[PDB]
Amino acid sequence: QKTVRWCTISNQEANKCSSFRENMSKAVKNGPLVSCVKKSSYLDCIKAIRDKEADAVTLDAGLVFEAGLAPYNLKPVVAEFYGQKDNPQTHYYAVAVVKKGSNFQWNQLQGKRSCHTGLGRSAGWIIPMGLLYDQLPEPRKPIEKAVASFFSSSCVPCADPVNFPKLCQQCAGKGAEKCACSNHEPYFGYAGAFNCLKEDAGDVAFVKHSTVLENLPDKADRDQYELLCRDNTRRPVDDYENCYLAQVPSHAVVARSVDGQEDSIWELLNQAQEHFGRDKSPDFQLFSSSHGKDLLFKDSANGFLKIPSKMDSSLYLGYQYVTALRNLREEECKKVRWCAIGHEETQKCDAWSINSGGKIECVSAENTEDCIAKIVKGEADAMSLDGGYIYIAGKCGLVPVLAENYKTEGENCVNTPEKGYLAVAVVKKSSGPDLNWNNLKGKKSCHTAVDRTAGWNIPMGLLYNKINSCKFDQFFGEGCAPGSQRNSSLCALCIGSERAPGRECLANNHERYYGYTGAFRCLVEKGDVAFVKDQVVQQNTDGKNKDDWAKDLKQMDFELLCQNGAREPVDNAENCHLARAPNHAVVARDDKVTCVAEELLKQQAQFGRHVTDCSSSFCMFKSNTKDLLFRDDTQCLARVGKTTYESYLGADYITAVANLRKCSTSKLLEACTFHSA
């Protein structure tokens, strides 16, 4: 019924696509149909997809980046994987292949002849040229001109043969097909570049790690070839793991960002790998063809993986690679951009910005995950996170910069490491003794949010060990666990916002039961147990909180549930808690750690706890509502040195969280753990 229109770039690809079509028709009765649209290069395909004349094409990651730019706006939806299906690799190695006895090293490439897969491609172009950049003769813009003056001549398929003739000089295509961006140029692609070297049109080929073994005959003339290593030595072709230029992400199928039919694309490809995958059929091979190498998909792929929905091109490629790509394409610690979540945090941020004289700038997002993603992508620089989210951010590659401290007051606060706060379970003293730790089934729970330390990871981790199931919403009766599935019973007690409707169960300040205070309010108004930090009761009772719901509460009206079944007063969490919680911390990308840390230590020297008059001046650690930007009981931000999320959080906490990985519903976590190695 549904049709996926695949874009081909050559007569050879068109031949394979016709057989893909015919074979899928026969093998799959109801699965999407395939039809083929024949263009003459990947760039014509990207445009055909944008204009809705086609739906899909497979691209080297370097070109995924170009497809993801305006005005094309395509996104990667399915990735090739290499290697064994039980340990799929979503990267491959770029290498430089030379013939034995040619006697030159990496540092002597000047004046040689080069064979490239194609302009703008990972192994063929982006990686080798990024490495050689500093040796190219200036001016290096555009890069083509500099490359044409560095190598004596080359074959770079897809280069403009009119403006850069030397880049197309060693290519082998006839007439108008010379230097073509397709299999009509014999030296196009991995196979082509290798043939370029083989036939002595070039002295070096920039290809991938499987290229030589894939393209050499029945037996091994393989001893005739070697690899150029970056330490200026040469190694055998099967020793690429010790002689590669870089590791690069998989070729991926791309599609329209809006109305891209990706559902259809995955359904097609998934069924196709089942019937016509590696060694699956004599009638048709997805990853092979008698008409050529790497047609439609690479011959070294062994299947497909669906790309998570939150992985856009930036996330798929990774920030380092996007920066190298950006570097070759366009031809400081002045400020810290904070990521604020929602309106109240944005207003506190704005105030900070003004008071700081612009050293702090403010970027907004509607939830924690969107903030973390902005930081990873370079749209923001820092925010403070609960341990549960540090874990997620750490998987996405962010690093802890400074810790919030809660126990140490005064001048030594910044230099004192704290062990952590405590995750506890708080109940009303008035609840009968049947309410205890071993009898929570069917009870009404209040949680700070899904994926936070005290609110979720610690308690739900403990419970998972008992019930051996991720269906928490079938264990508890009804609760408020912000961030849960909207029609779950774990959203049923949530009350959203007083001003705007439809905000129930959101994991942000629109939800009145969100956060430490929030969950304590949930306990007071509706729940039986709150999963929260120690001290939340003391901080919101006996008059410290003046809001209607809290003004008459007393500390003595609450108790803690201990794991042995007993109950203790709230002043005794040290002997009645669920586990230690790592202190919340400011995270940043590895390139900004120093900058973020140094400026914040200066911010707090001006705006920290010692400010006796908050109003005339700004107070970083006090908040109009609750835990705006930092926890309200934060005494200072403290140095953590050079550490990683794993050592910051501790093996005990890492163990607990990883224990729950099967139950995770975080879309960010799913995107940040997609890639191998």
User: Which residue ranges are tagged as binding site for hydrogencarbonate?
Assistant: 117, 121, 123-124, 448, 452, 454-455
Segment lying near Fe ion (by CB under 5 A), choices 3-11, 149-157, 332-340, 453-461: 453-461
| Structure tokens belonging to residue 102 | 């040619």
CA distance readout (Å), 483 to 83, 277, 305? 37, 39, 27
The C-alpha atoms of residue 386 and residue 388 are separated, in whole angstroms, by: 6
Interacting residues of 153 by C-beta distance below 8 A, sequence separation 6+: 113, 166, 169, 170
The C-alpha atoms of residue 218 and residue 224 are separated, in whole angstroms, by: 15
Q: Is the bond preceding residue 501 a cis peptide, omega within 30 degrees?
A: no
The three-class DSSP label of residue 197 is: helix
- Name the binding residues: 60, 92, 117, 121, 123-124, 190, 251, 386, 421, 448, 452, 454-455, 516, 584
318 vs 378, which CB is nearer to Fe ion?
Answer: 318
Q: Does the footprint of Fe ion cover residue 294 (CB under 5 A)?
A: no
- Provide, rounded to whole angstroms, the least separation between the CB of residue 89 and Fe ion: 13
- Provide, rounded to whole angstroms, the least separation between the CB of residue 321 and Fe ion: 12
User: Exposed (0-12), middle (13-18) or buried (19+): which is 122, by Cβ within 10 Å?
Assistant: buried
Segment lying near Fe ion (by CB under 5 A), choices 134-142, 169-177, 310-318, 450-458: 450-458
60 vs 599, which CB is nearer to Fe ion?
Answer: 60
Q: Does the footprint of Fe ion cover residue 457 (CB under 5 A)?
A: no
> Site size for Fe ion, by CB under 5 A?
4
- Provide, rounded to whole angstroms, the least separation between the CB of residue 121 and Fe ion: 5
- Provide, rounded to whole angstroms, the least separation between the CB of residue 386 and Fe ion: 4
138 vs 241, which CB is nearer to Fe ion?
Answer: 241
Contact string (CB under 5 A) for Fe ion, positions 25-64, x = contact: -----------------------------------x----
Q: Is the bond preceding residue 142 a cis peptide, omega within 30 degrees?
A: yes
Contact string (CB under 5 A) for Fe ion, positions 368-407, x = contact: ------------------x---------------------
342 vs 515, which CB is nearer to Fe ion?
Answer: 515
Q: Does the footprint of Fe ion cover residue 453 (CB under 5 A)?
A: yes
Q: Is the bond preceding residue 249 a cis peptide, omega within 30 degrees?
A: no
| Structure tokens belonging to residue 141 | 């813009």
Phi, psi (5° rounding) for residue 608?
-75, -165
Find out whether 74 and 49 touch, Cβ atoms under 8 Å: yes
- Provide, rounded to whole angstroms, the least separation between the CB of residue 385 and Fe ion: 9
Please name every residue paired with 588 in a beta bridge, in sequence order, or none if there are none: 399
User: Scanning residues 111 to 130, which ones bind Fe ion (CB under 5 A)?
Assistant: 122
- Name the binding residues for Fe(3+): 60, 92, 190, 251, 386, 421, 516, 584
- Provide, rounded to whole angstroms, the least separation between the CB of residue 523 and Fe ion: 16
- Provide, rounded to whole angstroms, the least separation between the CB of residue 455 and Fe ion: 7
**Where would I find the H helices in 545-592?**
none
| Structure tokens belonging to residue 194 | 């290798």
Find out whether 61 and 252 touch, Cβ atoms under 8 Å: yes
> Can you say whether the dihedral through the CA atoms of 72, 323, 640, 395 is positive or negative?
positive
Site for Fe ion, rule CB under 5 A: 60, 122, 386, 453
